[PDB]
Write a protein that binds this ligand. Structure first.
Ligand code: HEC
Ligand code: HEC
Lengths: 108, 108
């Protein structure tokens, strides 16, 4: 596409150090600061039940593919102005690839 | 996204009149002129087994989302030059929406 598979192992540790603070990925895992991401690929933005999303992400109505996921992760607020997600971004494409590789796998 | 849900019923009849000639959508349905489309959303282009795809679609490496699916259907060859898919396209957004609505549902 414009996303190439990376390291799932590398990707799992990026998750623990950069996303775990606010999210879980397991099926049946809870919402924390951010929503549980189980089954996020192919779902539109703002639709997990029981979570208070911003007006913004709901309206962005993003359909989540490994490619969408990558612009997003590069600069969250630039991609969804108004988002409450407080994350600067992952500037290197290799880190992004490793992380989506992990995600695509753990959120299934 | 940039795809809004349409009529699944409308969408099923567009399929019979415009795509059925070359494709099936059921799980366990065969390849004909074109490949069986069961489970196409979220899959990349050119990966159904047992089907001879063009060099072109394999290389396009499209990741299939209701939005990708829509530019594609607008003008197949313009989107994947080299494709063997012989279909002029569906120019009206409403027809496209009805058709992807059906597809998203029947290919699951
Ligand atoms: C807390 C300081 C966060 C960190 C670190 C990360 N995310 Fe996040 N995320 C956070 C919030 C509060 C929300 C909801 C935002 C809103 O505007 O309501 C999000 C949302 C997501 C989404 C969209 C979810 C949906 O259902 O559409 C995704 C895809 C996502 N977050 C992923 C994600 C990743 C992979 C992170 C590590 C690189 C990560 N976020 C960091 C809060 C926080
Ligand atoms: C025969 C005259 C066709 C008609 C009418 C339609 N399609 Fe088709 N499709 C055809 C071929 C020969 C192929 C493979 C092309 C190649 O270059 O190898 C395709 C491919 C698809 C795809 C991509 C499949 C994949 O696995 O990536 C899709 C998504 C698709 N076709 C859908 C589709 C729809 C929805 C149609 C009706 C509007 C339709 N096609 C018409 C042949 C023919």
């Amino acid at each position: 596409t414009e996303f190439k598979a990376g390291s799932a192992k590398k990707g799992a540790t990026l998750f623990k150090t950069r996303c775990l603070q606010c999210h879980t990925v397991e099926k049946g895992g809870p919402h924390k600061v951010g929503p549980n991401l189980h089954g996020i690929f192919g779902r539109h933005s703002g639709q997990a039940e029981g979570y208070s999303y911003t007006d913004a992400i709901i309206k962005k109505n993003v359909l989540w593919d490994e490619n969408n996921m990558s612009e997003f992760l590069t600069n969250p607020k630039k991609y969804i102005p108004g988002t409450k997600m407080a994350f600067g971004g992952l500037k290197k494409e290799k880190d992004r690839n490793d992380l989506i590789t992990y995600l695509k796998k753990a959120t299934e």
